[PDB]
């Protein structure tokens, strides 16, 4: 059930995102699985709408770079990942901690790939379900 | 035609999003036409991902700050909106300067709507291409 092509550490998983939009809102990649992905963002000003609850984008910027990063590691040598198409259903607020992100493969193809990324909230609680489709890049 | 059934300045809109995610990100709400809402995003290390180029999330971000502030301008009274789905095409990247969301109606019910968002870079050309799908709740 392993389904990586590179091997990488939590630490240099973690280490991507200084200086960007992932360091920015503080989305911390805590484990990789043989075949999943999980990262924890926290619910706070940087991350909020107007009104206290987690903003749904960026639940999908949550999605976005759980996804992105599982499909570069997906590939091998040069080869890269481009996002083609993201989707969100918004279930459940959030208002408060930290949400988990797990990320799952639906498709690992030789052209594209699609995972679903699961937001739940601290109690287990799904707040977000979402689809990625990529494009791998020769 | 003119859609809105709520007034509001560009700069009371501007303000909803002091110390939340939107102010955060530096979204600006630029023009309010009778039936479109525009608001501008920075290309900076608040919402790029680790290449250099806007995270696609910024982009569904951007898109959901539009549309949901869109959606409530359609409602009256003590009505409110909440987002159901969220979905964007990512088409070009965009590297510098400030991408321009431009939000119209797809569809407006009585207890439902759907906004269409493109965004586009500094020159004018499409990168995102996202629907909002909103409830309106009494």
Same mark, same amino acid.
């Given at each position: 059930?392993?389904?990586?092509?590179?091997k990488?550490?939590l630490?240099?998983? $973690?280490?991507?995102?200084?200086? $960007?939009?992932?360091?920015?809102?503080?989305?911390?990649?805590?484990?990789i699985?043989?075949?999943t992905?999980?990262?924890?963002?926290?619910?706070?000003?940087?991350?909020?709408?107007?009104?206290? /609850?987690?903003?749904?984008?960026?639940?999908?910027?949550?999605?976005?770079?759980?996804?992105?990063?599982?499909?570069?590691?997906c590939?091998?040598?040069?080869?890269?990942?481009?996002? /083609?198409?993201?989707?969100? $259903?918004?279930?459940?607020s959030?208002?408060?901690?930290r949400?988990?992100?797990?990320?799952?493969?639906?498709?690992?193809?030789?052209?594209?790939?699609?995972?679903?990324?699961?937001?739940?909230?601290?109690?287990?609680?799904?707040?977000?379900?979402?689809?990625?489709?990529?494009?791998?890049?020769?």
């Open positions: 059930s392993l389904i990586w092509k590179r990488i550490t630490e240099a998983l $973690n280490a991507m995102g200084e200086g $960007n939009m992932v360091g920015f809102l503080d989305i911390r990649f805590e484990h699985g043989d075949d992905l999980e990262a924890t963002m926290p619910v706070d000003s940087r991350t909020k709408q107007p009104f206290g /609850l987690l903003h749904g984008g960026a639940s999908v910027v949550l999605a976005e770079s759980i996804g992105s990063v599982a499909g570069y590691l590939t091998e040598g040069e080869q890269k990942v481009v996002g /083609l198409e993201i989707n969100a $259903n918004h279930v459940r959030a208002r408060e901690g949400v988990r992100g797990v990320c799952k493969p639906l498709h690992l193809g030789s052209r594209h790939q699609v995972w679903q990324i699961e937001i739940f909230d601290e109690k287990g609680r799904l707040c977000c379900s979402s689809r990625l489709t990529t494009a791998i890049l020769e």
